[PDB]
């Protein structure tokens, strides 16, 4: 609502709307619909075959605002507006289609072929968001009509399986409207006004948000199983690769603090390839999905070792000791975050 | 300086200009770029 149409986009826009309704009635003829008084699939006929003036003014109106709203979405997504030269637009490219493809309309069905224009990958990336926005517009319109999602379409209860997020939208209708949007934007650029794609933002959302306030869970053995002397081994299997920490913790370890942040835990974060005890250093490499981490503690000389699929993980230097020196204290138990 | 080096007069009007350049501008380039080497190589491949 806040944005307005610049005069250049407007006086190219009336011709854009003409071309769009033309392409609509010709896609209507390759789908094969004919001219008739009433629209019906069995009769395979449709009154909107004639040009916009003879075409029902109601449908002419709807074509026109959906075109203008689409291009306002183009402008509102941050598309770099620009023109190569007005001569390119003044030299509109106007082939003839074959006689069989010719229709009742006196003018030609396809003045311009998609062949000589090669849309930029950034342009298809843009038209992806354009399809997202068009689908969302249709969806809110149906919600305000009163429709709601249902696996089976029912006109009585206003149920539609198509009222789903576009990521889950059906592939058939998805690609149909998607190719319609292909050709719409391709004609927009090829008619003369070469809109430049917006900046391809490489910023990663990082998925910082999580369910509830809890951000990690700490799994540990019972405090009574603490070991104060001897050599011990246990394994950690990483089903999925991500932010996990495995190691040995003292029985006083807090369940709400990260492992290794305090002095009560000795952990290895392979996601960042880091050891964790009162801070983080660089230790070992990263694990992948399915990797198994074996944790060794030698409570005789107070050393700790880690493995990744068998091979010893090593420090920044050549030392294999993750933690050379620590007090026995009250013992250690296996722990993971 | 190439023009004046072919000339007989080897007096350089911009001697302190090039003194500043060579002994300040050049080393700060090296230090800055070795300190932030990763900053340039990072090319939307998400390092750091």
């Amino acid at each position: 609502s806040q944005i307005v149409l610049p005069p250049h986009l407007e006086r190219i826009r009336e011709k854009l709307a003409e071309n769009i309704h033309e392409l609509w009635v010709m896609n209507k003829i390759e789908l094969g619909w004919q001219y008739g008084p009433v629209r019906d699939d069995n009769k395979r006929q449709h009154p909107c075959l004639v040009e916009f003036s003879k075409l029902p003014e109601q449908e002419r109106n709807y074509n026109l605002q959906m075109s203008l709203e689409t291009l306002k979405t183009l402008l509102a997504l941050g598309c770099h507006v620009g023109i190569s030269d007005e001569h390119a637009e003044d030299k509109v490219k106007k082939m003839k289609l074959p006689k069989n493809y010719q229709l009742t309309s006196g003018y030609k069905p396809a003045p311009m072929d998609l062949s000589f224009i090669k849309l930029t990958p950034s342009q298809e990336a843009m038209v992806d968001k354009l399809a997202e926005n068009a689908h969302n517009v249709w969806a809110r319109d149906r919600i305000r009509q009163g429709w709601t999602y249902g696996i089976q379409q029912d006109v009585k209860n206003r149920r539609n399986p198509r009222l789903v997020p576009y990521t889950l939208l059906d592939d058939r209708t998805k690609k149909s409207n998607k190719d319609s949007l292909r050709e719409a934007v391709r004609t927009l650029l090829g008619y003369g006004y070469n809109l430049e794609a917006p900046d391809q933002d490489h910023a990663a959302r990082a998925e910082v948000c999580s369910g509830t306030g809890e951000r990690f869970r700490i799994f540990r053995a019972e405090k009574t199983y603490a070991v104060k002397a001897g050599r011990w081994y246990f394994e950690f299997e990483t089903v999925t690769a991500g932010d996990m920490r495995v190691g040995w913790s003292r029985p006083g370890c807090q369940p709400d603090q990260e492992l290794g942040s305090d002095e009560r835990a000795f952990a290895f974060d392979g996601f960042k390839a880091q050891r964790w005890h009162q801070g983080n250093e660089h230790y070992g490499r990263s694990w992948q999905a399915g990797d198994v981490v074996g944790c060794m503690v030698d409570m005789n000389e107070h050393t700790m070792m880690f493995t990744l699929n068998g091979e010893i993980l090593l420090d920044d230097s050549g030392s294999e000791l993750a933690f050379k020196d620590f007090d026995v204290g009250d013992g250690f138990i296996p722990v993971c975050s | 300086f190439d023009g004046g080096s072919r000339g007989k007069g080897e007096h350089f009007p911009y001697e302190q200009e090039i003194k500043f350049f060579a002994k300040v501008v050049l080393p700060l380039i090296d230090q800055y770029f070795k300190n932030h080497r990763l900053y340039f190589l990072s090319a939307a491949s998400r390092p750091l």
Binding site: - | F40, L41, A43, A44
Partner: protein, 292 residues
């Protein structure tokens, strides 16, 4: 340097300047080699040679090491960049093979710059049998009309006539190994050929079918792990036959350029194959020569 972002987004004068950089470097070492080979008898030429050794060898070596180690540069090297690179390789290799007292001073700088070139250069120039398969090839990209328009030999062999073929290079290095000749007679082989062959095979390991058996005979280049075992074996035999005298840090240079090959070969292949060098370290304990 950041070749990706420069090539996809860059202002045209910067583009032209970055091609002109290595074009000027190319003509620099071309005139340098021409005037030094013409100068069999002894100040402008001396200034050019000094500038060459001081800067051109470090500039090209550092740039090309960066390109090779970061494995990118493919879109950086396009029309006229390839031909600049072929002129540079022809000159540097032809003079690293030719023997002169002037070269014998900075042989090693050449020995490490030529190796960096081999890693950075993206088209298989040792092999021409299946070279047409390689899409990056300026021959395939540039098309017949432009290849006729450009000052191109129109034959891949004619592009680099001085350089030898890879298969005869490794059979001759095997022959030299079994002959056991000293480093003194023909040093050039063991300071340039070995580094370039190891850097070449190291870059094109994954291009070879041994990593991707698919698209068979559509492979750009053909190479095998057994060829690598032969290479490592005859390198060890070179560092074997050549222990008595002459010592040399070129031991350490060839070891560091062969570090990739011995790292990427399997440990089971390391066993029973490289234990000779560990036991020779004891066998040459009385000797002063340094190995590995």
């Amino acid at each position: 340097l950041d070749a990706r972002t420069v090539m996809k987004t860059g202002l045209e004068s910067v583009k032209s300047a970055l091609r002109a950089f290595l074009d000027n470097a190319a003509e620099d070492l071309e005139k340098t080699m021409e005037n030094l080979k013409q100068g069999q008898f002894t100040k402008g030429v001396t200034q050019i040679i000094n500038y060459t050794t001081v800067a051109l060898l470090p500039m090209l070596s550092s740039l090309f090491e960066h390109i090779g180690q970061h494995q990118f540069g493919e879109d950086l090297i396009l029309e006229d960049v390839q031909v600049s690179c072929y002129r540079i390789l022809t000159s540097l290799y032809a003079l690293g093979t030719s023997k002169s007292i002037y070269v014998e001073r900075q042989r090693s700088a050449l020995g490490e710059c030529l190796a960096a070139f081999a890693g950075a250069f993206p088209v298989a120039f040792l092999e021409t049998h299946l070279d047409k398969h390689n899409i990056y090839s300026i021959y395939n990209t540039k098309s017949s009309r432009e290849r006729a328009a450009l000052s191109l030999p129109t034959n891949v062999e004619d592009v680099c006539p001085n350089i030898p073929s890879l298969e005869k290079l490794m059979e001759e290095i095997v022959e030299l190994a079994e002959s056991g000749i000293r480093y003194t007679q023909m040093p050039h082989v063991m300071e340039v050929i070995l580094p370039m062959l190891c850097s070449y095979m190291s870059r094109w390991w994954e291009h070879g079918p041994e990593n991707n058996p698919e698209r068979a005979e559509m492979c750009c280049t053909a190479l095998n792990s057994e060829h690598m075992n032969t290479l490592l074996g005859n390198i060890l035999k070179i560092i074997y036959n050549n222990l008595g005298i002459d010592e040399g840090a070129w031991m350490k240079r060839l070891a560091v350029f062969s570090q990739p090959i011995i790292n990427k070969v399997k440990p089971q292949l390391l066993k029973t194959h490289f234990l000779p060098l560990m036991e020779k370290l004891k066998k040459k304990a009385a000797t002063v020569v340094s190995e590995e």
